[PDB]
Ligand SMILES: O=C(O)c1cccc(-c2ccc(F)cc2)c1
């Protein structure tokens with residue numbers, strides 16, 4: 434079942450922001466959020482789509498492994514870290530759109546649509562350019578639907594090989610210390626209004642796993658750090674992380 438804790442709204446209010454945090458206790462099978470309605474509001478996934486995109490590229494052989502090098506195409510872009518060679522891990526880390534656009538073109542429309550239906554991913558609509566629909570096309574996904582998809586990935590229940598899912602979960606590695614491990618992916622949607630930020634993933638503890646999915650209005654790049662900062666303040670408040 435689900436429980437709405439509006440006290441977390443303060444974490445958005447303090448920054449004059451609007452958004453939702455969704456948490457899911459895997460052991461107890463209970464969900465928590467500050468806004469049950471926005472928790473189910475569907476947005477463009479933006480770079481959070483790099484998770485399913487990575488899975489499909491790996492399972493079809495478009496990407497052979499996490500060490501394969503994808504050469505910079507010599508095009509200087511506004512993102513300095515994009516102007517270099519990448520593998521799957523660094524492509525994810527620096528959210529390298531042009532590398533995943535190449536993935537998508539090699540995957541192709543037919544296979545992409547088939548696999549998103551198999552994943553039960555959002556509205557499963559890839560309308561638009563095969564290499565940009567997750568940024569300005571017709572695909573939409575809610576925070577709760579992100580958690581649903583992530584839970585399948587965590588348990589290796591998605592309809593791709595176990596190997597593909599293990600590799601993507603490696604590439605999702607974001608933070609790890611003696612207290613917790615976070616595997617997650619950021620998102621920044623700017624091509625279609627409303628501009629929003631994403632952070633989706635899970636926090637691994639010794640004896641439990643908390644999946645999370647948050648998004649927040651993002652009129653400017655100045656607030657991108659709040660995607661992680663707000664989420665962690667909620668995690669701290671709920672005694673999930675110190
Ligand atoms: O989602 C991120 O964490 C991320 C990672 C790398 C780059 C950017 C980014 C993109 C466009 C922009 F206008 C400003 C920042 C966002």
Ligand SMILES: [Cl-]
Nearest residue numbers: 602603604606
């Ligand atoms: Cl790992």
